[PDB]
Ligand binder design. Structure first.
Ligand SMILES: CN1CN([C@@H]2O[C@H](COP(=O)(O)OP(=O)(O)OP(=O)(O)OC[C@H]3O[C@@H](n4cnc5c(=O)[nH]c(N)nc54)[C@H](O)[C@@H]3O)[C@@H](O)[C@H]2O)c2nc(N)[nH]c(=O)c21
Lengths: 704, 146
């Protein structure tokens, strides 16, 4: 309690200097060692594992305690090694890295002997020598080594440069033979201009190469221990026992490979501090620490924004740019962001509040840049951009200089930019209303605005007496008004001809039940629940469910949000099933709205519900099989028709279709992994056009 | 685990407590701490169920939304209830939707013990919400004066 607060608070807001507080804490801990050594050892191992953003602050504290008490220092180190093995054993490689870095920096604090770390790293790199083991296993150990260098590279080289060169040789040889099949599936942009979206290991290697070329000198990391050279130098070091990486097992789970998000360079902030380059270790450390800060404080938006803004460094940096960049890097991360998407929206708002005179401008600028680079942006990321921007706009009076994006008006309506604007406007309307959005946009954008979400009745004041089951529905309209029961509506649907499954009976029942409830969502939900017995009966068939969806769509095709909520309700009440909805989405009826966001939101919402169904493994697996089949079929038809008619393959329609397939894998990779054999044998075989097959091979590379 | 990292102030219970709640305080809190239902305040009178659906779905799937109505005029009086399927989703609405805008108004969310018949009406003497009985200002989105 008390001791935990002291250790966790060191380095924060204080009238005294950091070194002062550090030495002040070392004293307090030393005094409590006789009665609370166990608690102190645990707490220190804990901040080493959970507070990586404060790595040098705590390594220094350990160094000072080690100087005063060599025994305690040896126990701490022993405890760290034990926690590391347990972390690896539990597949917590992500936390394992912070421990490896903590042990590395401890060398600088004269707590651990340089030779010990060099010896351990050799065993790390030897992992790349293991045969028949996942590349993601080999990658992690390489990453653990390299990402430690920014902190201990200098020391390690100045003591065992000979040993370090052998390690670098093996490391480089390994990096040269790695597969990059995953890259295309994880890049936020395909274009390599203005910034290539690089594979994380190739990037880090380049940053370390630059560091090595600079005699292992970087200008960012804060090292409080340099102020205690007197004490630490006269402190005895400890040796690390030989380290043996836990062997690979069928139960081993390693981190997926990553691709570095990049959108800024020093030229984006001319009148500010020089932004560290994409290939500098400073850029790596800065971003890694800011990601860590968000990871620690994601539940407290105000505290998270304050910690990001108060981020410290050895030299000035264009922090606002780094912060916004790191946030978009998380929001746009593939397969998924580290935290729920909505948190990033509120987090940026809190940052605008904290740096009112500078953040809002950096953000408007980034938003301008994201827009202008939309042509090669992956569909999954575009969806998040659309959802963020619109939500953001709704928190600031929907104010925006749309005329700055007029360049979209003269483009193909299917092109990224104009489509983006249309989806944003559509999203803004859902948070407001038609006329509202129609006024916030320039006259030259009235076309890109969403149509008015008005109901559609085939048997309304426009219909004709010459319509199938016309009068039968007109009689139902009165039946619903007079408040009838299921049995009553049943007998009323008897007077319907059959052009079991009766298409007309279902049409008149829906076209009428929906129209007389076109008021609100609760009006529709209360209608479905009321005549639920009737629905089940009329939609017992699969063709019945598929028709209920087809009619409901022809009634609310101008109100995409109503379609979503209606589909979700029918599924939850067993009016229809996930399979019928999946088929409905690929039906020719929605072929024209197939590229619109609401379609994919409905699909993904449907899959999510299925993923929650208990004891439905078979049904869940079948849902995915069906989706993949439909995709393979429509994609193949397009690809063949382009080869037979010698037409363009990469059309806006294709970009979406192929990326929506990719999105299924990204969004549900863990589940889909269980279907590997079935997929390689029955669906994604060597017979598929390489365009389609590549998406499956990319998916497999995520854990290969 | 570290106390500092466990901090979750946005999910903590507020000081509000249904006085009409047929039960003890210890019991009301017992329900609040496991609720998936949130009370949403300071809504505009022209704020629709559809708009509330669009906003609150950003933290998860919504089971049901009950608009607050004037016990007499039976019209939207400025508040509602939002029920989620899981506790985790309600919590993320408390952490990230609470204190943000809906119709250019800063809304407030609070844990609720659970919906019951009648709780959707304004307990205000005039029919609407109690708070509106005392406000002095002119709120265009709340009918005007108090
Ligand atoms: C804020 N709410 C409300 N609710 C739930 O909403 C339903 C409708 O109830 P409502 O009309 O909002 O009224 P309450 O029952 O919620 O009562 P309130 O706390 O307003 O009572 C305040 C008491 O204080 C007295 N008072 C003196 N002076 C003032 C003043 O200047 N302002 C105010 N506001 N009160 C003043 C009053 O005379 C009164 O005795 C209903 O279902 C209700 O439960 C809700 N639910 C949750 N979970 N959380 C909330 O924050 C709220």
């Amino acid at each position: 309690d008390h001791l935990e607060s002291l250790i966790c608070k060191v380095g924060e807001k204080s009238a005294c200097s950091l070194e002062s507080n550090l030495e002040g804490l070392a004293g307090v801990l030393e005094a409590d060692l006789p009665n609370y050594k166990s608690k102190i050892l645990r707490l220190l191992c804990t901040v080493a594992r959970l507070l990586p953003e404060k790595l040098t602050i705590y390594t220094t504290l350990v160094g000072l305690l080690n100087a005063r008490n060599y025994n305690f220092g040896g126990e701490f180190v022993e405890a760290m090694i034990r926690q590391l093995k347990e972390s690896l054993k539990a597949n917590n490689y992500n936390e394992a890295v912070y421990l490896v870095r903590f042990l590395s920096d401890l060398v600088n604090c004269h707590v651990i002997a340089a030779p010990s770390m060099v010896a351990m790293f050799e065993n790390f790199v030897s992992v790349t020598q293991e045969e028949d083991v996942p590349q993601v296993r080999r990658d992690w150990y390489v990453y653990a080594f390299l990402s430690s260098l920014p902190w201990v590279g200098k020391e390690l080289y100045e003591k065992k440069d000979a040993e370090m060169d052998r390690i670098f040789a093996n490391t480089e040889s390994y990096l040269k033979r790695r597969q990059k099949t995953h890259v295309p599936m994880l890049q936020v942009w395909t274009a390599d201009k203005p910034h290539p979206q690089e594979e994380y290991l190739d990037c880090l290697w380049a940053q370390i190469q630059k560091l090595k070329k600079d005699r292992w000198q970087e200008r960012h990391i804060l090292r409080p221990y340099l102020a205690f050279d007197s004490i630490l130098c006269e402190a005895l070091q400890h040796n690390l026992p030989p380290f043996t990486p836990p062997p690979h097992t069928e139960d081993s789970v390693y981190p997926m490979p990553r691709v570095i998000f990049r959108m800024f360079d020093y030229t984006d902030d001319p009148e500010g501090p020089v932004m560290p380059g994409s290939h500098s270790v400073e850029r790596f450390v800065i971003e890694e620490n800011l990601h860590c800060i968000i990871k620690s404080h994601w539940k407290e938006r105000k505290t998270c924004a304050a910690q990001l803004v108060s981020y410290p460094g050895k030299n000035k940096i264009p922090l606002n740019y780094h912060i916004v960049e790191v946030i978009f890097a998380e929001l746009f991360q593939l397969p998924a962001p580290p935290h729920i998407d909505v948190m990033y929206t509120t987090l940026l708002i809190e940052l605008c509040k904290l740096q009112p005179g500078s953040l809002p401008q950096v953000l408007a600028q980034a938003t301008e840049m994201l827009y202008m680079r939309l042509d090669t942006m992956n569909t999954t990321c575009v969806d998040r951009f659309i959802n963020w921007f619109s939500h953001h706009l709704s928190n600031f009076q929907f104010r925006w200089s749309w005329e700055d994006w007029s360049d979209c008006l003269s483009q193909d309506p299917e092109s990224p930019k104009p489509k983006f604007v249309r989806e944003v406007l559509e999203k803004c309307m859902r948070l407001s209303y038609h006329q509202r959005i129609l006024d916030i946009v320039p006259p030259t954008f009235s076309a890109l605005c969403p149509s008015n979400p008005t109901c559609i009745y085939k048997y309304g004041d426009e219909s004709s007496n010459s319509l199938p089951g016309h009068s039968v529905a007109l009689c139902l309209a009165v039946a619903f008004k007079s408040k009838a029961t299921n049995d009553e509506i049943f007998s009323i649907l008897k007077d319907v001809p059959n052009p079991s499954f009766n298409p007309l009976k279902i049409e008149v029942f829906v076209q009428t039940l929906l129209h007389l409830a076109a008021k609100s969502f609760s009006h529709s939900f209360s209608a479905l629940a009321k005549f639920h017995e009737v629905f089940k009966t009329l939609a017992e068939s699969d063709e019945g469910k598929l028709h209920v969806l087809r009619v409901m769509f022809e009634v609310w095709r101008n109100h995409p949000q109503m379609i979503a909520v209606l589909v979700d309700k029918m599924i939850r009440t067993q009016i229809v099933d996930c399979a019928a909805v999946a088929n409905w989405i690929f039906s020719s009826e929605l072929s024209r709205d197939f590229t619109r966001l609401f379609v994919w939101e409905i699909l993904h919402s449907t899959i999510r519900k299925m993923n929650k169904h208990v004891g439905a493994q078979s049904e869940q697996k079948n849902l995915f099989l069906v989706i993949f089949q439909r995709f393979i079929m429509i994609l193949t038809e397009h690809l063949v028709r382009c080869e037979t008619d010698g037409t363009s393959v990469l059309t806006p329609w294709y970009k979406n279709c192929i990326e929506r397939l990719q999105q299924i894998f990204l969004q549900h990779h863990q589940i889909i992994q269980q279907y590997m054999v079935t997929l390689e044998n029955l669906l994604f075989t060597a017979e598929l056009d390489p365009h389609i097959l590549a998406v499956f091979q990319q998916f497999c590379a995520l854990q290969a | 685990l570290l106390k500092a990292l466990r901090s979750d102030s946005y999910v903590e219970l507020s000081q509000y407590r249904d006085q009409h709640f047929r039960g003890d305080n210890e019991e009301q809190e017992k329900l609040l701490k496991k609720s998936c239902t949130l009370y949403v305040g300071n809504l505009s009178f022209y704020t629709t169920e559809e708009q509330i659906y669009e906003l609150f779905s950003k933290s998860g799937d919504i089971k049901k939304i009950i608009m607050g109505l004037d016990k007499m005029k039976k019209t939207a009086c400025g508040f509602c209830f939002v029920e989620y399927y899981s506790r985790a989703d309600a919590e993320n609405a408390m952490r990230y939707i609470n204190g943000t805008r809906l119709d250019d108004r800063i809304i407030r969310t609070d844990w609720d013990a659970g919906f019951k018949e009648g709780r959707q009406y304004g307990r205000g003497r005039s029919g609407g919400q109690v708070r509106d009985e005392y406000r002095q200002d002119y709120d265009a989105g709340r009918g005007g004066y108090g």
